[PDB]
Write a protein that holds these residues in place. Structure first.
Motif, PDB file in Angstrom:
ATOM      1  N   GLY A  71       0.821  -1.246   0.109  1.00 22.88           N
ATOM      2  CA  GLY A  71       0.160   0.060  -0.085  1.00 22.88           C
ATOM      3  C   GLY A  71       0.616   1.311   0.130  1.00 22.88           C
ATOM      4  O   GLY A  71       0.597   2.023  -0.802  1.00 22.88           O
ATOM      5  N   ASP A  72       1.772   1.425   0.852  1.00 21.84           N
ATOM      6  CA  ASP A  72       2.712   2.433   1.012  1.00 21.84           C
ATOM      7  C   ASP A  72       3.566   2.589  -0.445  1.00 21.84           C
ATOM      8  O   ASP A  72       4.082   3.590  -0.442  1.00 21.84           O
ATOM      9  CB  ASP A  72       3.516   2.483   2.236  1.00 21.84           C
ATOM     10  CG  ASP A  72       3.082   3.164   3.504  1.00 21.84           C
ATOM     11  OD1 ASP A  72       1.764   3.378   3.651  1.00 21.84           O
ATOM     12  OD2 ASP A  72       3.792   3.189   4.365  1.00 21.84           O
ATOM     13  N   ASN A 168      -0.463  -7.455   8.950  1.00 17.54           N
ATOM     14  CA  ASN A 168       0.343  -6.552   8.758  1.00 17.54           C
ATOM     15  C   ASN A 168      -0.560  -5.251   8.858  1.00 17.54           C
ATOM     16  O   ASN A 168      -1.851  -5.213   8.710  1.00 17.54           O
ATOM     17  CB  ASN A 168       0.976  -6.446   7.227  1.00 17.54           C
ATOM     18  CG  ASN A 168       2.388  -7.359   7.024  1.00 17.54           C
ATOM     19  OD1 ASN A 168       2.240  -8.412   6.410  1.00 17.54           O
ATOM     20  ND2 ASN A 168       2.938  -7.104   7.986  1.00 17.54           N
ATOM     21  N   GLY A 169       0.162  -4.091   9.177  1.00 20.50           N
ATOM     22  CA  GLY A 169      -0.559  -2.711   8.970  1.00 20.50           C
ATOM     23  C   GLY A 169      -0.942  -2.287   7.776  1.00 20.50           C
ATOM     24  O   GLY A 169      -0.241  -2.837   6.824  1.00 20.50           O
ATOM     25  N   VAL A 170      -1.890  -1.712   7.578  1.00 15.24           N
ATOM     26  CA  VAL A 170      -2.662  -1.179   6.432  1.00 15.24           C
ATOM     27  C   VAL A 170      -1.167  -0.778   5.193  1.00 15.24           C
ATOM     28  O   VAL A 170      -1.215  -1.297   3.945  1.00 15.24           O
ATOM     29  CB  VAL A 170      -3.625  -0.198   6.479  1.00 15.24           C
ATOM     30  CG1 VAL A 170      -3.264   1.189   6.512  1.00 15.24           C
ATOM     31  CG2 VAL A 170      -4.682  -0.392   5.074  1.00 15.24           C
ATOM     32  N   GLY A 171      -0.631  -0.218   5.849  1.00 15.90           N
ATOM     33  CA  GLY A 171       0.611   0.362   4.693  1.00 15.90           C
ATOM     34  C   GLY A 171       1.396  -0.864   4.302  1.00 15.90           C
ATOM     35  O   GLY A 171       2.153  -0.201   3.250  1.00 15.90           O
ATOM     36  N   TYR A 172       1.416  -1.574   4.897  1.00 14.98           N
ATOM     37  CA  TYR A 172       2.119  -2.900   4.264  1.00 14.98           C
ATOM     38  C   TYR A 172       1.363  -3.969   3.680  1.00 14.98           C
ATOM     39  O   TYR A 172       1.997  -5.004   3.281  1.00 14.98           O
ATOM     40  CB  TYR A 172       2.931  -3.734   5.408  1.00 14.98           C
ATOM     41  CG  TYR A 172       3.765  -2.623   6.220  1.00 14.98           C
ATOM     42  CD1 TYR A 172       3.224  -1.602   7.394  1.00 14.98           C
ATOM     43  CD2 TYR A 172       5.167  -2.203   6.037  1.00 14.98           C
ATOM     44  CE1 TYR A 172       3.719  -0.735   7.979  1.00 14.98           C
ATOM     45  CE2 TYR A 172       5.672  -1.261   6.521  1.00 14.98           C
ATOM     46  CZ  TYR A 172       5.079  -0.488   7.552  1.00 14.98           C
ATOM     47  OH  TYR A 172       5.472   0.641   8.041  1.00 14.98           O
ATOM     48  N   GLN A 173       0.153  -4.074   3.739  1.00 14.16           N
ATOM     49  CA  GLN A 173      -0.624  -4.837   2.945  1.00 14.16           C
ATOM     50  C   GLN A 173      -0.482  -4.823   1.708  1.00 14.16           C
ATOM     51  O   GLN A 173      -0.116  -3.967   0.941  1.00 14.16           O
ATOM     52  CB  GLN A 173      -2.089  -4.615   3.534  1.00 14.16           C
ATOM     53  CG  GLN A 173      -2.390  -5.088   5.031  1.00 14.16           C
ATOM     54  CD  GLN A 173      -3.759  -4.968   5.278  1.00 14.16           C
ATOM     55  OE1 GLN A 173      -4.347  -4.665   4.652  1.00 14.16           O
ATOM     56  NE2 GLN A 173      -4.048  -4.938   6.615  1.00 14.16           N
TER      57      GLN A 173
ATOM     58  N   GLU C  33      -0.153   3.994  12.927  1.00 13.52           N
ATOM     59  CA  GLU C  33      -1.201   4.065  12.133  1.00 13.52           C
ATOM     60  C   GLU C  33      -2.564   4.628  13.125  1.00 13.52           C
ATOM     61  O   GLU C  33      -2.568   4.301  14.321  1.00 13.52           O
ATOM     62  CB  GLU C  33      -1.635   2.583  11.955  1.00 13.52           C
ATOM     63  CG  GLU C  33      -2.663   2.680  10.677  1.00 13.52           C
ATOM     64  CD  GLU C  33      -3.060   0.986  10.645  1.00 13.52           C
ATOM     65  OE1 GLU C  33      -2.244   0.309  10.003  1.00 13.52           O
ATOM     66  OE2 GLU C  33      -3.574   0.375  11.314  1.00 13.52           O
ATOM     67  N   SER C  52      -1.714   5.144   6.983  1.00 13.11           N
ATOM     68  CA  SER C  52      -0.436   4.349   7.732  1.00 13.11           C
ATOM     69  C   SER C  52       0.330   5.423   8.411  1.00 13.11           C
ATOM     70  O   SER C  52       0.201   6.682   8.272  1.00 13.11           O
ATOM     71  CB  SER C  52      -0.012   3.762   6.633  1.00 13.11           C
ATOM     72  OG  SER C  52       0.343   4.486   5.264  1.00 13.11           O
ATOM     73  N   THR C  57      -0.770   5.509   2.959  1.00 16.04           N
ATOM     74  CA  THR C  57      -1.800   4.686   2.498  1.00 16.04           C
ATOM     75  C   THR C  57      -3.110   5.161   3.351  1.00 16.04           C
ATOM     76  O   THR C  57      -2.925   5.568   4.775  1.00 16.04           O
ATOM     77  CB  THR C  57      -1.597   3.233   2.863  1.00 16.04           C
ATOM     78  OG1 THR C  57      -0.419   2.446   2.163  1.00 16.04           O
ATOM     79  CG2 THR C  57      -2.686   2.172   2.517  1.00 16.04           C
ATOM     80  N   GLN C 104       6.241  -3.919  11.119  1.00 13.68           N
ATOM     81  CA  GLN C 104       5.298  -4.074  10.154  1.00 13.68           C
ATOM     82  C   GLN C 104       3.955  -4.624  10.550  1.00 13.68           C
ATOM     83  O   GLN C 104       3.230  -4.768   9.784  1.00 13.68           O
ATOM     84  CB  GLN C 104       5.819  -4.682   8.841  1.00 13.68           C
ATOM     85  CG  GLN C 104       6.987  -4.177   8.461  1.00 13.68           C
ATOM     86  CD  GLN C 104       7.606  -4.677   6.887  1.00 13.68           C
ATOM     87  OE1 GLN C 104       6.899  -5.427   6.315  1.00 13.68           O
ATOM     88  NE2 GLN C 104       8.696  -3.922   6.400  1.00 13.68           N
ATOM     89  N   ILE C 106       0.569  -5.162  13.135  1.00 11.73           N
ATOM     90  CA  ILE C 106      -0.438  -4.554  14.016  1.00 11.73           C
ATOM     91  C   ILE C 106      -0.146  -5.090  15.420  1.00 11.73           C
ATOM     92  O   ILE C 106       0.040  -6.344  15.577  1.00 11.73           O
ATOM     93  CB  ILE C 106      -1.882  -4.865  13.682  1.00 11.73           C
ATOM     94  CG1 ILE C 106      -2.174  -4.075  12.116  1.00 11.73           C
ATOM     95  CG2 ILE C 106      -2.719  -4.443  14.500  1.00 11.73           C
ATOM     96  CD1 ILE C 106      -3.496  -4.778  11.690  1.00 11.73           C
TER      97      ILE C 106
END
Ligand SMILES: *[C@@H]1O[C@H](CO[C@@H]2O[C@@H](C)[C@@H](O)[C@@H](O)[C@@H]2O)[C@@H](O[C@@H]2O[C@H](CO)[C@@H](O)[C@H](O)[C@H]2NC(C)=O)[C@H](O)[C@H]1NC(C)=O
Lengths: 194, 211, 219
Positions: A71-72, A168-173, C33, C52, C57, C104, C106
């Motif tokens: 995503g990032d 993963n966090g959204v920026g890494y999905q 985040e 993010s 993101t 990376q 959550i």
């Protein structure tokens, strides 16, 4: 007869970004506004000209390039950017006037314990040229020692796995990406809006 | 409808135990341990009480505990205290945020009590003003939690429903009201309308018809 | 201690705009985040949007996609929500809350801290007296009056000018999506007393000196 956008956007699996796929669309009617509204997209950025106005032009060919990145990393899929993805995997020209579409694909491309099948190129001697595609797999030499095709100190395999995980966090999905490019030749222009 | 399903109301007396369930699917509660529980008093922000299914932040009473089985998570509160009365929300964030719809926990200070329901049809004055309001008044219930469903004849009614939150009466039972708006010709065409009030899984229903 | 300090709420007409802000302190903002979550009166928590750590993101609930923009300024420890083309149904309390990202992933303790919440009210209601309608009774009988479409609170309701108070229940008002209130008041009386006794509801709306006396009769 409608253009076959669905076999690109709704494809079961996508390519690793270093091995990005291209689909030629021709000889069909293409509704870029109804494709704007196919589903819900996280990113739909058209450079140069609007979609509603694309419905009034004709082209010889339209190309759909597609692949998966984080995503990032989607902000790199734009003219004039840099970073590992624009530099070593997929590069758009400064003068680009097509569209870039992207959406979150965590539900499809992440697996418990990591989807290791999606890769990117981490090391390369030079930057890609616009729309270059490099599926080379030769060991990268980081130092003065020659490598001769064996990994070791300062000798790296050039592809790195993303290892997408659902948590993963959204920026890494994982994000599926489609890039539309529009080609007009001295030839019949057969892809048009209705 | 919320992504995770919780009961609307749970209750227990002081000193006793209660459990709140939270049902999801195998790709959230069933597949991952990102299961959290939040407490919310009126007028304040949610507060994290349980995380990773069963762990509690420092400072949270060890009367709060959590577990899961299959696709259902459970918050258990033992040794109930007055200050536990609140709304509780479960959540799962295994890559996508999924909230439960919330459970109101009542700590009983009096016996449970079923609501009285009074239903009024549109007045002839209002119908001549080209409007039509059905008025369903719900009173004297405890715990203060109710769900209201409206029928046109035998069939559910979606739009035009406005329902209040319960509010404490002087006697510490609760009151609410539900208003169904229709056009005059909607009202005149069906044989009846019905107000159905569910409290603690038991339903009380009232019906009116155009005279 | 971790703190999230929100500001920027308020009252706006449908179609209008507001910008919410959330200022973080006591933790490394750029490692988190950040999310917005909202709660309409009497209803559940509804997730709205996420950004993010880097800001690159952003995702949105369907209910707000196309109209809201989440953004952050890490060097100022600030999270924002730009709200355009607002509609009645965006009326809610809006909270910010953090999700630490570590390696990376959550963290298990996501949403461990929340802002205090700011009220956003989307309405064009203006001062308006109510329309009052009688609610006719069919060994007791219930009769009342419907007190519709007034703004703002409160109204008071009496019966027979205050001579009648046993059996009176005036219900708390509903708030409609238009911004207007409506309430009802009912009194329970002996059935034997209908006709030979007459009942009048006295509605006072002091925010709009509308006083109404209305009697309620059987039909
Ligand atoms: C991507 O797929 C969705 C889902 O549609 C499924 O696959 C389609 C190719 C078709 O077989 C659908 O009936 C399947 O349900 C597509 O959305 C559908 O679009 C059609 C018009 O072609 C519409 O009649 C359906 O109701 C739509 N269904 C949904 C879920 O919206 C979508 O158009 C496909 N995207 C592209 C780029 O073609």
């Amino acid at each position: 007869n409608l253009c076959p956008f669905g076999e690109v956007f709704n494809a079961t699996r996508f390519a690793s970004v270093y091995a990005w796929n291209r689909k030629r669309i021709s000889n069909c009617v293409a509704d870029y506004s109804v494709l704007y509204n196919s589903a819900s997209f996280s990113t739909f950025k058209c450079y140069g000209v609007s979609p509603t106005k694309l419905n009034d032009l004709c082209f010889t060919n339209v190309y759909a390039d597609s692949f998966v990145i984080r995503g990032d990393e989607v902000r790199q899929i734009a003219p004039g950017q840099t970073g590992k993805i624009a530099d070593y995997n997929y590069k758009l020209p400064d003068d680009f006037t097509g569209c870039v579409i992207a959406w979150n694909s965590n539900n499809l491309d992440s697996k418990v314990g990591g989807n290791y099948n999606y890769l990117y190129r981490l090391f390369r001697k030079s930057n890609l040229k616009p729309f270059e595609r490099d599926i080379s797999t030769e060991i990268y030499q980081a130092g003065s020692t020659p490598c001769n095709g064996v990994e070791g100190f300062n000798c790296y395999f050039p592809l790195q796995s993303y290892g997408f995980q659902p948590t993963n966090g959204v920026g890494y999905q994982p994000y599926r990406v489609v890039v539309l490019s529009f080609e007009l030749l001295h030839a019949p222009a057969t892809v048009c809006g209705p | 409808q919320a992504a995770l399903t919780q009961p609307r109301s749970v209750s227990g007396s002081p000193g006793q135990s209660v459990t709140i369930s939270c049902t999801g699917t195998s790709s959230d509660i069933g597949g991952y341990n990102y299961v959290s529980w939040y407490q919310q008093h009126p007028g304040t922000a949610p507060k994290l009480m349980i995380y990773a299914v069963s762990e509690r932040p420092s400072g949270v009473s060890d009367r709060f505990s959590g577990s899961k089985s299959g696709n259902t998570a459970s918050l258990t509160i033992s040794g109930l205290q007055a200050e536990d009365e609140a709304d509780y929300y479960c959540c799962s964030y295994a890559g996508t945020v999924l909230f439960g719809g919330g459970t109101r926990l009542t700590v009983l200070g009096q016996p449970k009590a079923a609501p009285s329901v009074t239903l009024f049809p549109p007045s002839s004055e209002e119908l001549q003003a080209n409007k039509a309001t059905l008025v369903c008044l719900i009173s004297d219930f405890y715990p203060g939690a109710v769900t209201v469903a409206w029928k046109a004849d035998s069939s559910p009614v979606k739009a035009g429903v406005e329902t209040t939150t319960p509010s404490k009466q002087s006697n510490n039972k609760y009151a609410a009201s539900s208003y169904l708006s229709l056009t005059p010709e909607q009202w005149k065409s069906h044989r009846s309308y019905s107000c159905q009030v569910t409290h603690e899984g038991s339903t009380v229903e009232k019906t009116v018809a155009p005279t | 201690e971790v703190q999230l300090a929100e500001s920027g709420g308020g009252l706006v007409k449908p179609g209008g705009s507001l910008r919410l802000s959330c200022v973080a302190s006591g933790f490394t903002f750029s490692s988190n985040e950040m999310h917005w979550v909202r709660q309409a009166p009497g209803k559940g928590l509804e997730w709205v949007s996420v950004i993010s750590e880097s800001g690159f993101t952003t995702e949105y609930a369907d209910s707000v996609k196309g109209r809201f923009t989440i953004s952050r300024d890490n060097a100022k420890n600030s999270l924002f929500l730009q709200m355009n083309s607002l509609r009645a149904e965006d009326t809610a309390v809006y909270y910010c809350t953090r999700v630490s990202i570590f390696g990376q992933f959550i963290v298990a303790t996501y949403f461990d801290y929340w802002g205090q919440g700011v009220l956003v009210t989307v309405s064009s209601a203006s001062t308006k007296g109510p329309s009052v309608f009688p609610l006719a009774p069919s060994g007791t009988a219930a009769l009342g009056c419907l007190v519709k479409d007034y703004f703002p609170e409160p109204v008071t309701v009496s019966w027979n000018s205050g001579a009648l108070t046993s059996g009176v229940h005036t219900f708390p008002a509903v708030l409609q999506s238009s911004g207007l209130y409506s309430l009802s008041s009912v009194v329970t009386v002996p059935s034997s007393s209908l006709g030979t006794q007459t009942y009048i509801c006295n509605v006072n709306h002091k925010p709009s000196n509308t006083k109404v006396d209305k009697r309620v009769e059987p039909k």
